[PDB]
Design a protein around this nucleic acid. Structure first.
Ligand SMILES: [Zn+2]
Lengths: 81, 103, 201, 49, 225, 115, 61, 31
RNA sequence: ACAACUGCGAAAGCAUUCGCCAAGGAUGUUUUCAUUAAUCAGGAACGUAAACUAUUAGGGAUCGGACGGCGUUUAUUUUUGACCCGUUCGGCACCUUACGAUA
């Protein structure tokens, strides 16, 4: 307070700032890869999906939508990129 | 327009803190307190009400207040009175009791 | 014809008991004002317990209680202690000639800002109209949120009932206090003991 | 003049680092009559004893 | 001392207790005690036999003197009477009511009560209404003063409440329903099954009202007694 | 011990000491407050309630019930929901002259929404 | 003073007290109770003593 | 009440008896 | 009664349950046309009373999302919810300070 480096905020204070209020704004959502153990299929799901994402066939599920992050279903794997 | 109505409303604090309401707990305590069971309590209440009447007639300063104190007594007295009124305001904000608004 | 004698001297077969429930901000004050309450209720013969875990005041008639109206006195006492009347006044209901009353005034004004204005009008400038009503009616009035809790003799209960309804119905309490002062002045002399006093108000 | 206030030192260190008596306990706390959940735990302990 | 009346109004007083006889009252089956009191009814003769009035009356009696347990100082029950014997008065269930002292003794501020009403019919074709009340549980080791359930959560609680009372009162007869109402099995199961939605401090059934009884059968009415 | 149910309607204008059987249908004996006091001003008074309770307890001990369950009420629709002096004074006199009291309940008509 | 102002015993004892003090020479007037407020004084008694009153009467110097 | 006024008047009568005795004895019975 | 230093609606206002009908707010998104916008002349829809009076700089509460989790209770164990905590948007209101003002 009184003087601070405004071009170099700390990553920890930057990380607790709201989305639109970081120095250059940017998202905080991510993409996941999801397989369901009987299938060798790799569907890529967005973290905050509004669609009941289905794998390439097999009338299953992969996630359900919410007010925030998509709740991935049951036993499923996820790497995140 | 009316006089004795205006006198009954202003002096109600002094009367109800002196002795005049035996169903109120503060007045039922001050009816046996000792400074009202003494010999000339009614005359002393009369002096207080006459001082308030001349104040309502236009006097800026009082006769009953003490004017010189050693600055630690007056700071302790004013701080204790303000803390008492603040604690009553907080314990009336909780319990939902509404109180008289005054700055 | 109106005075009531204290009870001189087992009148209870089924061991009666009453309960009331209070919140936490009252739990603190009740926890450090309770020994006065159980002292006076032991002088009346009724066991009074307090439960900070559930938040409940209980009274129950013991073996050696002899006054049978004491259980009604104690039930009203724990009702007022739950409804945050201060403790010496709640214990002042245990005298013979006192009674409490709760006046629901939220139903009387449709608006909200008009209700807030009329409630503060009932309370008055610096509480002066409220303590003037307490003096003229010999009552204890507590403007309690949406309700008004009054205590005192039954005559004063009736007059503060009339004054609270007329204050909510936009008649001013200063007008009602002037009315009560005129009634007190007329009832002072019994030369005018039975006339229709409407020619003076 | 200058010795320790032992109660105040114990309270300072506390705010820095942060079958024969349990019957007369109930004898002293049945008289209040505040119920006071530590007494509920003491009643369960007395029932187990 | 001085009278007040008009001209020729005081009739000659007749004794009304020559024409009155007492009748002991027995409670139905699932209550612990049977002799519950005594009723002074008029003397039977032609032109309104007194057994019609004895078929008409109902009683209101607490559960403490029935179960001999002062745990139930509240929950006053109501007993119709439809049968008569020699110096006897056989009764049946009609309704179950709280006391308004407990209804004031349950309501606290900064917590939600949820009320639910059902019109359920037992297997003996008695229609009855069950009014359940349920106060919200203040969780220990909490700091926030208000334990408010959301409105959608209240609607889910009321839905589970009416589902439980329908599924556990539609299958039994009236005698088993009273035998389940007495130790409050219904409120216990509502407390057990609603705690995944919002925990409830106490669930009671505050009223039972029998609306219509289409049968007069002395077989089951005496199988009670 | 034959329990009779005593309805005590304690208003501000008159008190009603009323004794019924357990049913509620058959009135055993009632004495109002104003029939014991010459003054309509003092009709609702502790003396009136004491006289009424003494007469009611005398009649019901001549009939031999000697035990009451007491239900106290007041004017409750748009009224006061509090009993007058008649309730306290009548219960005091009633149990002071015999009459082992059983269960006490204040059954006032409380409206869910009146006006 | 603390008695009410229209009281008979207040008026009678005011006249008695003022007449007694003026007869003893402490007060110089008998028509004000503020004389007994702030004019009755141990110096007034001590100047009603004998050597001061004969100093005033010039019996001595 | 009025008993407060009567008690105050009797207190002033008692005070004046004591004070008149003291003042007459201090003026040495010339009064 | 619950019933609030709360919630919703632009305002007056709105409190029993359940069903239907559209609408609205905020949040989240891995959503699109890219100035569409701001303000109000004219105009248009909704409608007995009064009476004492670019930030402030955060903190404590509060509710509506969304995310995270040492854990207690659901839970016969996963959901999920309740409680506690932290981050983040959004909003009714409190106090302190004015950043000042000014009629
Ligand atoms: Zn697949």
């Amino acid at each position: 307070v009184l003087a601070v480096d405004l071009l170099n905020p700390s990553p920890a204070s930057e990380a607790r700032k709201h989305k639109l209020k970081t120095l250059v704004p940017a998202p905080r959502s991510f993409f996941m890869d999801v397989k369901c153990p009987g299938c060798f299929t790799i569907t890529t799901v967005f973290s905050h999906a509004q669609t009941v994402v289905i794998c390439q066939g097999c009338t299953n599920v992969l996630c359900q939508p919410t007010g925030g992050k998509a709740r991935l279903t049951e036993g499923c794997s996820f790497r995140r990129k | 327009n009316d006089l004795a109505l205006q006198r009954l409303i202003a002096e109600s604090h002094i009367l109800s803190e002196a002795g005049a309401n035996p169903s109120h707990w503060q007045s039922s305590h001050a009816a046996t307190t000792g400074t009202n069971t003494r010999a000339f309590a009614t005359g002393r209440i009369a002096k207080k009400t006459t001082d308030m009447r001349i104040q309502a007639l236009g006097a800026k300063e009082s006769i009953l207040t003490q004017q010189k104190m050693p600055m630690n007594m007056r700071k302790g007295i004013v701080k204790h009175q303000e803390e008492k009124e603040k604690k009553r305001r907080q314990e009336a904000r909780e319990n939902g009791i509404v109180l008289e608004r005054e700055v | 014809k109106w005075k009531i004698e204290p009870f001189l001297p087992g009148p209870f077969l089924e061991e009666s008991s009453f309960m009331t429930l209070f919140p936490k901000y009252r739990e603190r004050y009740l926890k450090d004002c309770w020994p006065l309450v159980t002292k006076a209720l032991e002088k009346h013969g009724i066991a009074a317990t307090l439960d900070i875990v559930e938040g409940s005041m209980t009274v129950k008639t013991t073996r050696k209680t002899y006054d049978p109206a004491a259980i009604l006195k104690a039930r009203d006492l724990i009702k007022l202690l739950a409804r945050s009347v201060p403790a010496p006044q709640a214990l002042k209901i245990l005298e013979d000639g006192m009674a409490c009353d709760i006046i629901k005034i939220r139903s009387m004004v449709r608006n909200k800002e008009r209700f807030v204005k009329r409630r503060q009008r009932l309370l008055g400038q610096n509480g002066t109209t409220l303590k003037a009503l307490e003096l003229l009616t010999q009552t204890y009035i507590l403007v309690h949120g949406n309700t008004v809790s009054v205590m005192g003799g039954y005559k004063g209960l009736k007059e503060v009932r009339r004054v609270v309804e007329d204050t909510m119905n936009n008649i001013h309490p200063i007008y009602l206090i002037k009315e009560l002062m005129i009634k007190r002045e007329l009832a002072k002399d019994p030369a005018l003991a039975h006339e229709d006093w409407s020619r003076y108000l | 003049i200058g010795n320790l206030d032992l109660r105040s030192e114990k309270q300072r260190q506390a705010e820095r680092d942060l079958n024969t008596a349990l019957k007369k306990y109930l004898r002293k706390q049945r008289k209040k009559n505040i119920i006071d959940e530590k007494r509920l735990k003491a009643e369960e302990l007395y029932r187990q004893m | 001392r001085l009278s007040k009346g008009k001209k020729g109004l005081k009739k000659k007083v007749q004794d009304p207790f020559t024409r009155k006889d007492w009748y002991n009252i027995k409670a139905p089956a699932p209550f612990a005690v049977r002799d519950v009191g005594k009723t002074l009814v008029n003397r039977t003769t032609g032109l309104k036999n007194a057994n019609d009035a004895l078929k008409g009356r109902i009683f209101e009696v607490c559960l403490a003197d029935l179960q001999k347990d002062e745990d139930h100082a509240f929950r006053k029950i109501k007993l119709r009477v439809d049968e008569v014997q020699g110096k006897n008065c056989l009764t049946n269930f009609h309704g179950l009511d709280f006391t308004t002292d407990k209804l004031r003794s349950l309501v606290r501020k900064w917590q939600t009560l949820i009320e639910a009403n059902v019109t359920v019919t037992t297997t003996d074709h008695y229609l009855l209404r069950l009014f359940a009340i349920a106060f919200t549980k203040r969780r220990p080791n909490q700091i926030k003063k208000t334990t408010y359930a959301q409105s959608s959560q209240i609607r889910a609680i009321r839905r589970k409440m009416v589902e439980i009372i329908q599924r556990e009162a539609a299958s039994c007869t009236l005698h088993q329903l009273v035998s389940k109402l007495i130790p409050e099995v219904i409120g216990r199961e509502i407390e057990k099954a609603t705690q995944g939605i919002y925990p409830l401090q106490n669930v009671h059934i505050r009223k039972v009202k029998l609306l219509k009884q289409p049968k007069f059968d002395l077989g089951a009415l005496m199988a009670l007694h | 011990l034959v329990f009779g149910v005593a309805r005590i309607f304690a208003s501000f204008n008159d008190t009603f000491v009323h004794v019924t059987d357990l049913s509620g249908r058959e009135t055993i004996c009632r004495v109002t407050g104003g029939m014991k006091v010459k003054a309509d001003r003092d009709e609702s008074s502790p003396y009136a309630a004491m006289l009424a309770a003494q007469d009611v307890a005398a009649r019901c001990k001549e009939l031999g019930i000697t035990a009451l369950h007491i239900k106290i009420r007041a004017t409750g629709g748009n009224g006061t929901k509090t009993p007058g002096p008649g309730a306290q004074s009548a219960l005091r006199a009633l149990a002071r002259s015999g009459m082992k009291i059983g269960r006490i309940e204040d059954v006032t008509p409380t409206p869910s929404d009146s006006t | 003073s603390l008695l009410p102002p229209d009281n008979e015993v207040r008026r009678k004892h005011e006249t008695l007290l003022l007449d007694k003090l003026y007869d003893m020479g402490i007060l110089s007037t008998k028509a004000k109770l503020s004389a007994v407020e702030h004019n009755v004084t141990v110096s007034a008694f001590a100047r009603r003593r004998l050597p001061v009153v004969m100093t005033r009467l010039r019996m001595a110097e | 009440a009025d008993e407060k006024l009567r008690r105050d008047e009797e207190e002033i009568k008692r005070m004046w008896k004591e004070i008149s005795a003291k003042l007459d004895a201090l003026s040495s019975w010339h009064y």
